[PDB]
């Protein structure tokens, strides 16, 4: 309870305040980094307000971490002091599963999340709303020189997720017609990756005063209003797949109507509070599918970030200081951001 400082929630109220704690010494396989930036994710919002009821306190959120290695263990092969490194959703895993062994490490039942979790021996994991971070080399990402740290930080989670989903479900080929539902953090990262894979992108939305970022800033080929039951119906059976990034309850059936029969896939990556109805009749009669995806494993996250570098993909961010974080959270509940918050941890997190 000393050698590291950050901000933490104590309550399901999710209100965050200064908090001091200790990180482990750097083991033979560990990298320590000074945290320079930490993205804010809807997962952090859910965790601090204990949306799903598992979370215990004090809770230091943050899992979109970028920084500079300050210390490497002797057994470390990938990294040296000074490297630009990242840490995403995970800091640990089983190490011996079927999942852990074929780089699907986001599915060992003993996965150790970067924030709001604990190791086997009971010690709680504190995320990147803090001045420094320690992680096994195995969960550390190299940030390419040609991407800025602040705008790469959110790729560690939003980017890994959309890329892993597009790869896994076979929606990463030129010409394919991809729909993206929601135009928040994930939504805009999804559009950038889809355009870089060569797919025609239609954004599906509820905010018509966002068409303009969708078409012009983000470069999407088409724009649809969720409820515009007349334009939607003109877009029926058109799309090879849809990535749904909305973390709010919303109707699934109209999205299914946009999908190609005996082909189209609705891939869900936003996790809401309540669950919608399963459109059994549409799935059966159109021979359509719904699959879910979460963040990809560490190799796939490295591959994602190298792909983003090759294609100059960056998240569209708003830099904020640490003591704005509570306001930032309130703004996330509203979608009021373009598109992702990033905390400037180095310049604005200070010791109490
Ligand atoms: Zn996230």
Give the span between the Cα atoms of 104 and 88, in whole angstroms: 14
| Strand-pair partners of 79 | none
Helices within the chain (DSSP H only): 42-48, 149-152, 158-168, 185-197, 211-212, 231-234, 253-257, 280-286, 298-310, 325-333, 345-348
Q: Considering Cα of 59, then 63, then 65, then 69, what sign does the dihedral take?
A: positive
> Which helix H or strand E contains 324, and what residues bound it?
none
State the method. X-ray
Distance of CA 177 from the midpoint of ligand 1 (Å): 26
Q: Which contacts (CB < 8 Å, 24+ apart) does range 167-171 have?
A: 167/296, 167/300, 168/291, 168/293, 169/241, 169/265, 169/267, 169/291, 169/293, 171/199, 171/240, 171/241, 171/243, 171/265, 171/267
Distance of CA 163 from the midpoint of ligand 1 (Å): 14
10 Å CB burial of residue 186 (0-12, 13-18, 19+) is buried
Distance of CA 64 from the midpoint of ligand 1 (Å): 6
10 Å CB burial of residue 257 (0-12, 13-18, 19+) is buried
Distance of CA 229 from the midpoint of ligand 1 (Å): 32
Distance of CA 257 from the midpoint of ligand 1 (Å): 29
Give residue for tokens 């011996």.
96
Q: How far is CA 130 from the centre of its chain?
A: 19
CA distances from 327 to 14, 132, 321, 332, 335 (A): 11, 23, 11, 9, 13
Give residue for tokens 């060569």.
198
Contact status, residue 223 vs residue 202, Cβ threshold 8 Å: yes
User: Which one, of 203, 207, 210, lies nearest residue 224 by Cα?
Assistant: 203
| Pairing of β 124-125 and β 222-225 | unpaired
| Pairing of β 30-40 and β 289-292 | unpaired
CA dihedral 323, 324, 329, 334 (to 10 degrees): 170
Distance of CA 41 from the midpoint of ligand 1 (Å): 4
Chain breaks in the chain (C to N over 2.5 A) after: none
User: Which one, of 225, 246, 250, lies nearest residue 181 by Cα?
Assistant: 246
Q: What is the DSSP letter of 306?
A: H
Distance of CA 281 from the midpoint of ligand 1 (Å): 33
Distance of CA 154 from the midpoint of ligand 1 (Å): 7
Distance of CA 88 from the midpoint of ligand 1 (Å): 8
């Amino acid at each position: 309870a000393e050698n590291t400082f950050g901000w933490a929630a104590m309550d399901s109220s999710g209100v965050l305040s200064p908090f001091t704690f200790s990180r482990r010494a750097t083991g033979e396989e560990d990298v320590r980094l000074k945290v320079l930036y930490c993205g804010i994710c809807h997962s952090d919002l859910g965790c601090i307000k204990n949306e799903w009821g598992w979370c215990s306190y004090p809770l230091v959120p943050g899992h979109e971490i970028v920084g500079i290695a300050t210390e490497v263990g002797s057994k470390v092969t990938k990294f040296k002091v000074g490297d630009r490194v990242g840490v995403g959703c995970m800091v640990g895993s089983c190490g011996t599963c079927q999942n852990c062994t074929q780089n699907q490490e986001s599915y060992c039942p003993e996965v150790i999340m970067t924030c709001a979790s604990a190791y086997p021996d009971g010690t709680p994991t504190y995320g990147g709303f803090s001045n420094q971070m320690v992680a096994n080399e195995k969960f550390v990402i190299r940030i390419p020189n040609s991407l800025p740290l602040d705008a790469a930080a959110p790729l560690l989670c939003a980017g890994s997720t959309v890329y892993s989903a597009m790869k896994f479900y076979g929606l990463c080929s030129q010409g394919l017609h991809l729909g993206v539902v929601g135009l928040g953090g994930l939504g805009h990262v999804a559009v950038k990756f889809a355009k870089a894979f060569g797919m025609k992108v239609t954004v599906i939305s509820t905010s018509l005063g966002k068409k303009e970022e969708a078409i012009n800033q983000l470069g999407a080929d088409s724009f649809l209003i969720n409820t515009d039951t007349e334009q939607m119906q003109g877009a029926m059976e058109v799309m090879d797949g849809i990535i749904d990034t909305v973390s709010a309850l919303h109707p699934i059936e109209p999205l299914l109507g946009l999908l190609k029969s005996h082909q189209g896939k609705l891939i869900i990556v936003g996790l809401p509070n309540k669950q919608p109805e399963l459109p059994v009749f549409s799935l059966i009669n159109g021979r359509k599918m719904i699959g879910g995806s979460a963040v990809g494993g560490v190799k796939e996250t490295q591959e994602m970030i190298d792909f983003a570098a090759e294609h100059n993909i960056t998240a569209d961010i708003e830099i904020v200081p640490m003591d704005y974080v509570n306001t930032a959270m309130e703004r996330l509940e509203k979608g009021d951001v373009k598109f992702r918050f990033v905390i400037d941890v180095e310049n604005t997190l200070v010791a109490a």
